[PDB]
Structure formats: structure tokens, C-alpha cells
Design a binder for this molecule. Sequence first.
Ligand SMILES: O=c1ccn([C@H]2C[C@H](O)[C@@H](COP(=O)(O)NP(=O)(O)OP(=O)(O)O)O2)c(=O)[nH]1
Ligand SMILES: [Cl-]
Ligand SMILES: [Cl-]
Ligand SMILES: [Cl-]
Ligand SMILES: [Cl-]
Ligand SMILES: [Mg+2]
Ligand SMILES: [Mg+2]
Ligand code: NA
Ligand code: NA
Length: 326
Amino acid sequence: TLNGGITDMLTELANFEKNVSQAIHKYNAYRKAASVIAKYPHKIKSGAEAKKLPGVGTKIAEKIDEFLATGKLRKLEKIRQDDTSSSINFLTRVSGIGPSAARKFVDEGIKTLEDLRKNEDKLNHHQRIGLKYFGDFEKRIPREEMLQMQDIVLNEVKKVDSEYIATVCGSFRRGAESSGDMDVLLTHPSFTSESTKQPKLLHQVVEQLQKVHFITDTLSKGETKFMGVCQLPSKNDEKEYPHRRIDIRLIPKDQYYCGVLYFTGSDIFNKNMRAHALEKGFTINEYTIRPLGVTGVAGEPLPVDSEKDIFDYIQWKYREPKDRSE
DNA sequence: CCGACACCGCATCAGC
DNA sequence: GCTGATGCGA
DNA sequence: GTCGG
Ligand SMILES: O=c1ccn([C@H]2C[C@H](O)[C@@H](COP(=O)(O)NP(=O)(O)OP(=O)(O)O)O2)c(=O)[nH]1
Ligand SMILES: [Cl-]
Ligand SMILES: [Cl-]
Ligand SMILES: [Cl-]
Ligand SMILES: [Cl-]
Ligand SMILES: [Mg+2]
Ligand SMILES: [Mg+2]
Ligand code: NA
Ligand code: NA
């Protein structure tokens, strides 16, 4: 973090545009800049120097000069002191409360953790659980704990059906020393792009994980995506571990590589790679990579037998997971 | 200039 | 009930 | 907010 000060500033700006301005493109613009700057191997000495990087334009360049000179940004100095913006940014930290619900609550006089707690009847299910674990979800997960969680999930999944294959993706697969949550990609031979010869595939696993008291709550649950909460079991007299967010995605067995590519991320890396694909005339999603006919319509799925294959199509040299943390 | 900006699952809603 | 639009995941 | 054509 040679340019931590600058990347943080950009991220704060990004969050403001997203949560308060509800301006998604400005949000992604700031995030892109923060990203490219974060991997820049030098201690930025000026905005001009930064403007050389792709994604950093005139505005961010001037902002970087202000920052380098004063150590702060007036624009943010202001935003920080605006109560409505401050309340809004805060409420969006609760899982399930977005920019819209956040602004709505602020309109109704609900702007503090305290307020949220005394108005649970005004929250939907997800938001209710997000509030419950507000503190816990703010904590990072040491890789060591991810390893223990991985063991349980794979072993429990195995027990349900030896034919299940559970892979931990997200930041964990990228080699991070800490993770915001645990993301699990799941496959089973009975569920392919061709057919679903067995129902309740995801349910059965969620079921088992709940039985062994690993999954404590559910934020949302469908046929192929589970979003919930889990906790590692603690020892006698040992204090309890924090509750953790867990995402489970059931993907067609024959679309594993596109699935693992997607779920490994990062989200910004996928955004960059998917944009490059488009420039190259392809479209990539968690299921497949399809060509783009002049008419704009996507074509039939191209054959894929490795993450690398996807990279080859868009003429990108393969990049290891550990190098996709953009 | 100015249009494009990655992609999609599940919860919840309004209109029918 | 359905379907389409929106919010949120993120 | 930034970019390519
Ligand atoms: O906007 C998104 C969000 C997620 N994803 C993919 C990539 C990401 O790495 C993966 C898992 O989502 P998380 O939100 O769990 N992020 P990640 O695991 O990378 O980091 P963290 O440690 O915060 O969980 O899903 C996208 O493609 N787009
Ligand atoms: Cl925008
Ligand atoms: Cl600042
Ligand atoms: Cl695939
Ligand atoms: Cl597809
Ligand atoms: Mg994650
Ligand atoms: Mg996740
Ligand atoms: Na630039
Ligand atoms: Na939130």
C-alpha cells in the first residue's frame, strides 16, 4: 500500500457516489482508478503521474494533487460533515439495506444502529439478520479460520453425496490471508446444462450444514444460490467465533470452469475481463463464453475445458488466481 | 462529442 | 396466480 | 468519471 492514502480517498468517494448519489458509473469509475492505482508499483508523486494510468482522468488527477499537498480532500471533508450523507453511508453497511432503503429510513427518522434495533418490524428478513450480525459481519476472517470452515463444508458435503464437489472460491481461492466471507461453488453430476436429474440439490447440502449447526441463518435461498450465515464450533470454555457470511452457488457440472472463473473474482477483475471479452467480440458469464454476432446477439457456447481456455479466446495470457485481486 | 460502462440470482413489489 | 421492474446481493 | 472512435 504505497498509495494507501490515495486509494482510500478514491474508495470513500466511490462509496459516496454509490450510496448517496446513487450514481453507479461514478462509483465504478472511482473503484477502477483505486484499483489501477493500488497495483501501481511506485509511490505516486502527482496527479499527472497518476493520470498516465488508465481509469485516472483529469478530475481524479486534480483530486490527487489536492490530497498529496494537504493530506485531505475538501469535497470529502464536507461530505463527512453532512448528517444525511453520514447516516445514509452508515445504514448501507447493514447487509440488505441498500442506497434506496437507506435513504428511505433516513426520511423516516431511522438513522442509527439504535433506531434500527427499535424498528425491526420495519425491516425485511435479510435486513433483520444483517442488523443482528452487524458487528460480526464487519470482522475479517483469518485464513486459518477459512481452512477450518473449508474442512467442515467439504466433509459435510461429501457425507451427503460423495459425488458432490465443493470448491471454496472468492478471495480465499485467490490466496488472501483474510476474507470478508466464504464463497462455495458446488457441482453434482445430476445437474448439468443438459438436465436436472435430481431436485433439492442445493437444499440437501444447506440442510446438512444446518443440521451440524454450521449454518445458523438464511438471507436468501433459491435453486442455485444460497446466501446465509455460518459459525465455526468453539471448544469448551472457549469463547464463540463470530458469525460469518457464507455464499453457496450450485453450477452445472459441465460449466464448472466458467463458474469457478466467475466465483474466484475479483469482481473488478471479472468486470475488466468481461469488458475485454466484449472488445474481442465475446461475452462471458458464470456459465459460458459465447461469441457476438454483428447483430449484437450472443451465439452458441464455445467449448471450455480449463480456466485458461477462456483466457485464450479473448487473447489474454492466463493469470493465476493470486494475480486476479484487482 | 457521446454512448458505453459485466453479468445475473433471489426477494419484493405493482399491475393485471 | 403471473410477469415485469426494482432493489440488493455487491 | 473515464474512455474510445
Ligand atoms: O459484483 C460482483 C460481486 C461478486 N462477483 C464474484 C467475484 C467475487 O470474487 C466473487 C465472490 O463475491 P464476494 O462478494 O464474496 N467477494 P470476494 O470473495 O472476492 O472478496 P471478499 O473477501 O470480500 O469476500 O463473486 C462478481 O463477479 N461481481
Ligand atoms: Cl453514474
Ligand atoms: Cl479526506
Ligand atoms: Cl465451463
Ligand atoms: Cl449462458
Ligand atoms: Mg467472498
Ligand atoms: Mg460472498
Ligand atoms: Na489516464
Ligand atoms: Na448493505
